[PDB]
């Protein structure tokens with residue numbers, strides 16, 4: 001089959017970090033990609049699953065605004081919600097029908113008592129994340145509990161991604177049990193050490209690049225939430241990117257790519273931005289931007305630029321400068337090569353990437369834990 005546009009038109013998308021409604025031109029192709037653009041798209045990339053309407057339920061409501069239709073999608077272990085608004089009810093119905101057609105057209109023992117519930121890691125609209133301990137193994141896991149109302153496919157394993165081990169559902173809930181690293185939060189390590197050495201950051205940076213490459217080329221998904229808070233270390237001291245994300249309703253926007261703040265089309269380059277912010281904090285001991293006013297913090301990320309400390313090396317300068325480019329098309333890793341643009345960078349000279357993936361590179365830091373069951377970083 002050939003990928004063509006099923007329906008295109010102007011919609012009013014609710015901003016994901018801005019309560020306001022925003023005029024965006026959306027394209028609905030038969031591959032399932034529902035992407036919206038600030039202006040009518042240039043007639044001139046690879047398919048990302050972030051925008052796929054596959055396995056999504058459409059809900060038409062009149063709140064908080066009349067003629068509203070909501071797409072609700074289960075992506076990996078996180079329910080995402082995208083709210084849209086049209087002017088006439090007839091437009092909504094031909095939009096939902098079009099999307100429902102493509103969505104359907106793309107079809108082509110374990111219980112709660114087995115775990116011990118120590119800490120609430122996060123709460124959200126469609127569920128919560130809880131730090132649990134399996135009674136039998138004595139091991140620590142993160143359980144992602146989602147509302148049910150809202151096949152072992154574990155070839156999704158990767159050394160630097162929190163593994164989704166299994167999935168079970170209770171009466172009215174769907175629970176995702178996943179690995180929880182006990183090497184402590186990385187921000188807790190960074191703040192404790194104030195700043196990472198340039199080579200140490202290289203290590204953490206390399207392992208993230210490996211994982212991002214994996215998500216982009218194999219899984220064709222964008223992580224989109226690459227921040228310091230979402231990075232942990234395992235007992236060995238290697239990076240684990242978490243998957244504890246939840247939708248919430250009603251500083252925080254610092255880790256956000258400019259195109260994401262402007263609710264434009266975003267792609268893989270967003271993760272490289274995220275990567276830039278993280279590696280900036282590791283080598284500088286400070287976020288790129290800080291100011292309190294959300295309108296000023298937004299404009300900081302949108303138009304103001306990033307100063308570099310003279311303590312920083314020139315190779316790190318070129319890397320952060322490229323990673324933290326305002327325009328995703330000019331951004332390092334933003335072209336077709338993706339992660340290859342970043343892996344070939346001089347900051348990562350002498351770093352062989354097959355070895356990073358096989359954890360051959362010796363960690364520059366070893367967490368103070370005898371075992372995975374060591375609760376030294378939880379207390």
Ligand SMILES: *CCC(=O)Nc1ccc(N2CCN(Cc3ccc(-c4nc5cc[nH]c(=O)c5cc4-c4ccccc4)cc3)CC2)cc1
Pocket residue numbers: 075076077078079080081082125156157161162163215219221222223224225241242243245246247248249
């Ligand atoms: C409140 C409204 C709303 O929609 N809120 C909201 C905003 C943002 C998000 N997310 C969703 C999760 N995303 C992080 C993320 C991205 C990708 C994965 C992931 N995906 C796949 C897909 C297919 N196969 C895989 O093996 C995958 C693995 C992973 C993955 C990535 C890293 C670690 C573990 C697993 C997971 C999380 C952030 C923004 C949601 C709701």
